[PDB]
Amino acid sequence: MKQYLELMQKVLDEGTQKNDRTGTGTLSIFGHQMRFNLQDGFPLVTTQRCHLRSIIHELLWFLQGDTNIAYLHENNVTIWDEWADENGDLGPVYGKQWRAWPTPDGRHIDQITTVLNQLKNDPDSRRIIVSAWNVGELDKMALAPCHAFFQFYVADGKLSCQLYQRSCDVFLGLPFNIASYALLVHMMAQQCDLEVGDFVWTGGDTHLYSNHMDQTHLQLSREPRPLPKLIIKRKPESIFDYRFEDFEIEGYDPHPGIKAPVAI
Amino acid sequence: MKQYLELMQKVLDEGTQKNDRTGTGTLSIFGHQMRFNLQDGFPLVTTQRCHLRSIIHELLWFLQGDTNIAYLHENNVTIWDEWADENGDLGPVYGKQWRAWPTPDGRHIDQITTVLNQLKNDPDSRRIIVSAWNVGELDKMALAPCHAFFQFYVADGKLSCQLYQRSCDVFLGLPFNIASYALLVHMMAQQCDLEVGDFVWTGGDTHLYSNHMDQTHLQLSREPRPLPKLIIKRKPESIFDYRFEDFEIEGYDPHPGIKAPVAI
Ligand SMILES: *[C@H]1[C@@H]([N+](=O)[O-])C(=O)NC(=O)N1[C@H]1C[C@H](O)[C@@H](COP(=O)(O)O)O1
Ligand SMILES: O=c1[nH]c(=O)n([C@H]2C[C@H](O)[C@@H](COP(=O)(O)O)O2)cc1[N+](=O)[O-]
Secondary structure, eight states: OHHHHHHHHHHHHHOEEEOOTTSSOEEEEEEEEEEEETTSOOOOOSSSOOOHHHHHHHHHHHHHTOOBTHHHHTTTOOTTTTTOOTTSBOOSOHHHHHHHEEOTTSOEEOHHHHHHHHHHHOTTOSOOEEEOOOGGGGGGSSSOOSEEEEEEEEETTEEEEEEEEEEEETTTTHHHHHHHHHHHHHHHHHHTTOEEEEEEEEEEEEEEEGGGHHHHHHHHTSOOOOOOEEEEOOOOSSTTOOOGGGEEEESOOOOOOOOOOOOO | OHHHHHHHHHHHHHOEEEOOTTSSOEEEEEEEEEEEETTSOOOOOSSSOOOHHHHHHHHHHHHHTOOBTHHHHHTTOOTTTTTOOTTSBOOSOHHHHHHHEEOTTSOEEOHHHHHHHHHHHOTTOSOOEEEOOOGGGGGGSSSOOSEEEEEEEEETTEEEEEEEEEEEETTTTHHHHHHHHHHHHHHHHHHTTOEEEEEEEEEEEEEEEGGGHHHHHHHHTSOOOOOOEEEEOOOOSSTTOOOGGGEEEESOOOOOOOOOOOOO
């Protein structure tokens, strides 16, 4: 998208050479923000073809509070295969913290539910937050949350959301994350009878892996196409009752996809 | 400061009228980011006189893991009086989460120390994070963290930091928060033998209280002055051994202060 490609170009021009956890090496910048008015269309890249099936199921997976890949397998999504153990468990990652943040006094807090309640009863609240960064359980996670913290905001009947992503693989992960949260905002907005507002993306360590250079330059030479449209065929009783069939994307005509190795 | 004043003006131009928790009413925007190259000087507002004594003592207080105002009273700082109970307790706020985030299995994590360890042994890590947003204890806090999440970054021997502030009182709180974190970066950098890099500030609900409008336009009509300089007179054994006396600010010639009512 225009914002996406400019960020990608920015990492190449200003990025600094860093040695990472994987030993692959990256080019990175620290601190960046981009806004997406969801009224203009669904922020799904067009300079690269994205598998919408994987994005929708992972989000529905998160909302269930599931941390076992069994569910993703039944739907043919193998994006979390590398980090899962023999049983398909990942530890108390994303979903677990969203749906059941464990407190020291034995209780469990459902952040998504409180957020829905805040949106409906106290939309002006400045504390409408969901955090996946549970310091007490990071050690038990197969991987620390990349998209770790997000906040909702309501103004003029429009629902906005800002995401703080501490670590970001610009080529492989970013376009997946943007679509994922944009989708959530739509689901939230529908359940709370609000209009969609802006999706603000804020990143920490924003990088481009050294073995993605060629693919990046390839994508950078492509002209972005008009943004698609997200259609939701029905309104479920709750935000936990959505299904894959409920979502329809229209006007999505992307350039052919680009293959690239994943850094584990 | 140029960045500060432009932000202020932006809230006036693009802000939307919102009703808040205090019933005061605010003008607010959602999502904003500004950078401060700490090499250019210490980011302490000049178009308004700021009380450096309060900023430093609160920070030292945070670093001790203290949540009782007794310490602040002993040094004549009354910035937290309105929220403290009869005993001067505020609940597990900032300092408690920083020095002793309680895990569900009876342990306690010192986030400041682990960060120091990461900067010395693994500066290229993308998980150098401190979070005050402990979902499980928000209900026990006198007030939910405004400056809730921050991340460090190292590149070219320079230490940078990005802060995510979910709620921001632009007139009363922002200049205080900028100076506080900028001071932390210098302390961190000095302990780890690194140079100071950038301080990136990112905000969620960034606002201006309706009863702060006149004061705002008054300040906005002022010409910012050259940034002051921070001088640290010594290098303590640990980041927990600093004292008010170790800090010296030079070349600070601000405009006269502007009084304004605090929204509780
Ligand atoms: C809160 C604050 N704090 O110490 O508590 C700080 O450091 N900076 C702020 O600007 N800040 C403000 C934001 C908001 O106007 C209120 C807190 O209220 P809620 O956002 O309603 O929780 O204080
Ligand atoms: O959704 C995501 N977004 C994303 O870009 N990341 C990337 C960032 C980075 O390249 C890597 C995780 O590594 P580290 O930052 O070393 O923990 O994976 C990883 C996730 N993720 O695992 O869910």
